[PDB]
Ligand binder design. Structure first.
Ligand code: ATP
Ligand code: ATP
Ligand code: MG
Ligand code: MG
Ligand code: MG
Ligand code: MG
Length: 347
């Protein structure tokens, strides 16, 4: 039995913990917040700040099989980079790839350098899409309908179409492009639902090439919009993602935690077909169910399993109003929809 140490106990941490459990691994959480979101979901919880008390983490690295950073605190990531040679186990992270992926402008320069289409910068006609250069979860992302308009903000052409995610796990030499998923967006451009998509040869080749040219040793997701004039890559994020890996697990049978672990041990090779519906629903006043995105879920107080039966998993995120994360799967759309209705009827 393997043990994984996660640094970060919010949504990235949940995803990693969830898949580690599916892989039969013990989950050790480190987080500076005494009431970190997934503290009760982990098998062990150690509350400390890794920057303030690095020896505690280094000692933990002697007792676990891998350390996985699952936060986007640049201070933390940069600090871990500075001490990574001192770890007694592998650190499942690509610090160079993250340096590029975290900065949307640097990422776009990277896309351009290898001929990957990406939205036009500073268009002359509305609507414009605007976003910060270094946020996540669509924080600060908004549409602007007139040139009546902020610091180092990205201003792009608004590309209408499906938002599609693809994960790649690299071992430095081989790059495993995994499973396409559809990102369902809400009025805030946050993601409230994920479903799987059939293979797209072009997107897979593009994603392979983005990983290969680094070269990636770690995990990265690639996001593109299938726009009216073709695919446009909007961003990359070289860290363990939330939401999509659960859909990847059920739709493809691939456990991204197992794959990432393999990349830092035995290596990876390049290359199920079920349906899966993954969504978040808030239980509002008078029991009115409301779709919400990650920004809402990340404001919760306690996150863990609520219910399971065949083809149905439900997680409850406690807080001001409860948020349920619902996972449904089956052989096809029809059966999965049937499981969705059963899951909803439970609520
Ligand atoms: N140096 C650190 N040591 C331990 N845990 C950390 C450190 N930096 C961040 N974390 C934890 O990782 C989790 C995710 O952090 P991240 O900064 O990615 O998201 P966030 O929502 O901005 O976090 P916060 O709740 O601090 O605003 C948080 O629970 C946070 O407490
Ligand atoms: N140029 C664009 N045209 C249209 N929609 C866009 C554009 N850029 C971003 N979006 C929308 O905004 C959302 C968030 O943007 P983006 O993924 O670039 O930021 P992020 O917050 O770093 O995302 P992530 O949560 O994946 O870390 C996208 O999923 C998409 O719905
Ligand atoms: Mg992002
Ligand atoms: Mg995906
Ligand atoms: Mg994104
Ligand atoms: Mg990015």
């Amino acid at each position: 039995m393997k043990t994984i140490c996660l640094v970060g106990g919010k949504l990235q941490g949940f995803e990693a913990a969830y898949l580690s459990k599916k892989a039969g691994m013990k989950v050790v959480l480190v987080d500076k917040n005494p009431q970190a979101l997934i503290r009760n979901y982990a098998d062990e919880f150690y509350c400390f700040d890794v920057i303030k008390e690095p020896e505690k983490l280094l000692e933990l690295s002697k007792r676990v099989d891998a350390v996985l950073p699952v936060n986007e605190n640049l201070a933390c990531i940069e600090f871990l980079n500075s001490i990574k040679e001192k770890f007694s186990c592998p650190v499942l992270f690509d610090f160079e790839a993250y340096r590029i992926s975290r900065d949307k402008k640097k990422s776009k320069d990277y896309f351009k350098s290898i001929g990957v289409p990406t939205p036009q910068d500073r268009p002359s006609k509305p609507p414009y899409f605007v976003k910060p250069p270094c946020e996540s979860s669509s924080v600060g992302a908004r549409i602007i309908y007139d040139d009546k308009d902020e610091p180092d903000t990205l201003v792009e052409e608004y590309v209408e179409g499906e938002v599609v995610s693809l994960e790649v796990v690299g071992d430095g030499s081989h790059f495993a492009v995994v499973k396409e998923t559809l990102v369902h967006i809400d009025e805030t451009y946050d993601c409230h639902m994920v479903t799987p998509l059939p293979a797209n040869p072009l997107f897979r080749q593009i994603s392979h090439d983005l990983a290969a040219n680094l070269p990636l040793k770690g995990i990265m997701d690639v996001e593109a919009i299938f726009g009216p004039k073709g695919l446009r890559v909007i961003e990359i994020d070289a860290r363990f993602p939330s939401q999509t890996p659960t859909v990847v697990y059920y739709s493809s049978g691939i456990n991204l935690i197992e794959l990432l672990f393999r990349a830092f041990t035995d290596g990876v090779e390049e290359i199920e077909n079920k349906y899966c519906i993954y969504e978040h629903l808030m239980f509002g006043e008078n029991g009115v169910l409301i779709p919400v995105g990650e920004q809402v879920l990340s404001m919760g107080s306690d996150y863990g399993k609520f219910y399971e039966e065949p083809g149905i998993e439900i997680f409850l995120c406690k807080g001001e109003y409860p948020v349920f994360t619902m996972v449904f799967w089956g052989k096809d759309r029809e059966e999965t929809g049937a499981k969705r209705c059963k899951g909803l009827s439970v609520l």
